[PDB]
Each structure stands twice: as C-alpha cells, then as structure tokens.
Amino acid sequence: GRRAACGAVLLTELLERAAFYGITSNLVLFLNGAPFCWEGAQASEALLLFMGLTYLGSPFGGWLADARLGRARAILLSLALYLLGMLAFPLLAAPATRAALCGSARCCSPATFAGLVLVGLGVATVKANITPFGADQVKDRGPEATRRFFNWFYWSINLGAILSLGGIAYIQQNVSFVTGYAIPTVCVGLAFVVFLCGQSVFITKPPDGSAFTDMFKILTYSCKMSHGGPFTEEKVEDVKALVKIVPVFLALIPYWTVYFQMQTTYVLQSLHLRIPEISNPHTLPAAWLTMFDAVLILLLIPLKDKLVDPILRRHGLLPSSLKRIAVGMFFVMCSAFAAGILESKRLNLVKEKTINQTIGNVVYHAADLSLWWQVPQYLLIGISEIFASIAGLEFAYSAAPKSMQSAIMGLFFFFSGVGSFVGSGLLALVSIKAIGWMSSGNINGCYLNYYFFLLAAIQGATLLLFLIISVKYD
C-alpha cells in the first residue's frame, strides 16, 4: 500500500546523502590539484564555507517550502539545482571539458564557486524538507508506523553515508576523479528520477506556513507584550521560549566549528602524514578515517542507549542535558589539544626527514610519522558528538512547546552553519600577512598547530563561560 511512497523517500535520502558525502570527502584533495593551484588553507576555507552554507540554508529552505511554493515542489526544485551542481563538478574535473569552462592562484574560481553555491542550496533545501515529508507519508497509520519508518530512515542515512565514504572516496582518491565524481551525479540523477516518477504516489499537503514568519513579524513589531498587539499570547509565549533556547546553540557554536574542522583541516594533516598503501599505488583513502568514526557512531549509539542509559536510570546519578553538553565540549577540547600536539610533533619531525607521496595527481611532502596516530582525534570527535549534539537537541526539545518542531531543528542547523562560517573566518584571519601563521598546497611552511591551539583555547573560554552561566541557571 504505502510501501510505494515510503520506499521512494528512503531511496531518495540514501542517494542524496551518498552524493553529498562523496562530494564533501575528497574536495580538499580535488582543489589542491593540477587544474586548481589552490593552497591548503584556501581549499579548507572553501570546503568549510560549503558545509556552512549547506547547514545554514536549512531554515531558509524550510521557510521557502512552508510559507510559499510547497513541500514536494521545494524538494523537486532543490534536487534539480543539486543535479545542476552535480553536472558542474565532473565537467570541471574532466580534462577535455575543463577547457570550455576555464581554458583562458584560482584558475577556475567562478565555476567552482557557482557549482558549490548551487550544490549547497540544493542540499540545504533537501535536508530541511525531506524528513518532514517522510514523516508525513506515514503519519496517518500511527506512532508505531512512524517509529518503524524512522528506524528505516536512520539506517538509510547511515548506509548512504558509509557507502559513500567507502566506495566513492576510494574511487576518487585512487582510481580517477572523473568517474568518482560522476558516480554522485548518477546518484543524484537516480534520486531525481525516483522523486519525479514517485511524485504521483506521494501524499502532499498545502503550504501551511512555518513559525519563522510569526517570529520575524513579532520581532519587527517589538519581555515583549501579550494581548496588546495583533499577535496572540500563545505566539508570544513560543517566541519567548525560543529566545530562552537560543543561548544553548550560541554556546554550541565553537563546538560546531571544531567539529566541522573534521574533514577540512584534519584531512589536510592526514594527507601530510604517512598514509599506508593497500595495493601494488592505491593509498588508503583519507576519508576512511571519518568513515571509521561514523561506523563507531553506528556501533555505539545502540550500545549507549541500550546499556549505559538503562542501568544509569536504574541506579540514579544520571546527568542532565547541560552536563552532557559540557562533557561533549570537554572532549572537543581534548580533540583539539591532540590535533595541536600531533601537528607540532609532525612539524618538528619533518625538519629533517620527509618522504614524497602521491595521492591522486599531486605529490605531498609528508612526514615519516604514521597516519594511524590521528585516530585519537577522530575518536574524540565522535564521542564528543554523541555526547553533545544529541544532548543539545534533547535540551531544546525539553524547553520548547510540542508544537514547534522543525523550528528547533532549523535554528540548530543555522547555528551549526554559523559555527562553520566562524571557523572559516578564523582560518582566513590567521591566514593574513599581519599574523603570518599560514602565510607561506604545502603546509610545512605554515603553522597549523597554532590554529588548532587557538580553536582549543576559544572552546575552553566558551566552556568556562557556559559552566559559570549554568551554575546560576541550575
């Protein structure tokens, strides 16, 4: 009956996530190549801006879907734009057609910026709109049907990301870039075809109107006021609740900065470490580290929720949401410290010994030290993620009315994107000639350890301020 509609949503989400993670994983290696004479800092900033845009356009995508247009039509248009970007990327990667784009230190900046902008907007709208759509397609049956559907959605997202980070990343790093970038385009084309042909069997609703319009109208009109202006008391109470919720995300911003460093600068460091070779010369993909962290997250969340939580509740001593957020930020602190220590050790070691390794088309003068010592940073990032990202939304939901979902998620994604933008801005600020931290794709002449220590220090200041505020709050 409804399996023709739920399956289409599941498949579309799987293909979309596979394409997105295929693009994001090997973008730093792609830009730091032959067609583009981009440095490490510039490529890291570009990928950080791309991720920040993808996560910051989500509230605007939701407002576009709800206030006007529609939900299904918004997903369709976003998939069209995202496929346009997925056609822009391989046409640029192929040597033959790159001449038509940019034949005559950013060789093809306009094309690689237009493609990134279009992909970011499409991904933002699809990510903001697909989950309410999937919930709507099954909400009629009952809570248990929605629970089963969202178990399937959880697994679909995980397998999409894992299959991407394994296969597409391996192909892009070792086999070629044209095929490894056409595969996500084929995935997006299949997703678009599935959604277009599956549109007739979908259950759609007219545009209702998100709470963002009421938020902005109240803010422009304006403790606020009750039953004095046109707005009702319930809307004012909801806006006050959201204002009370915002500071948690405002404090979580540096957390998301350090998190989104995961596959921007940690990947660069991994490229500049000694990556093992797994074939007679196919090196290990640099995205397999974040794939391993994702596998750890999948293996641990059921483990956590089924072992730690039940006995913790039975024996007491359970921590509140804010304590879990603080623990997550402390683990982020430790991850940044570990990254700084590793980078300092690598920079001290490379002063005399360096081995030339090739990863794709470009040759990296890596150090002797092995890649596997970077595992603690990724493990700490994953543990901090499970401790903090979930607890933040749990607290926000516990402090918001039950009628305001998809607005908590919108603000959460918006502040995550703001954190990514802040990280990119900090990298650019330390990239100036006044400081000269990264004013030397080789980062051996740069100072990445100082940048990692700065991230750790700002995270520490934020954590101490958060704890001092939370003592009074609790």
């Binding site: 989950t131 919930a135 929605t146 969202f150 959880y154 990301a161 969340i301 993620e385 979930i390």
Partner: peptide
C-alpha cells in the same frame, strides 16, 4: 554532521 541521522527522528526515540 554524522549525528543528523539520529537527530532526524529524535522525538520518536530514534
């Protein structure tokens, strides 16, 4: 982020 798969249906105890 890698946790958004779990965060998508958090209210349903995903």
């Amino acid at each position: 982020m890698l946790s958004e798969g779990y965060l998508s249906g958090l209210e349903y105890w995903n």
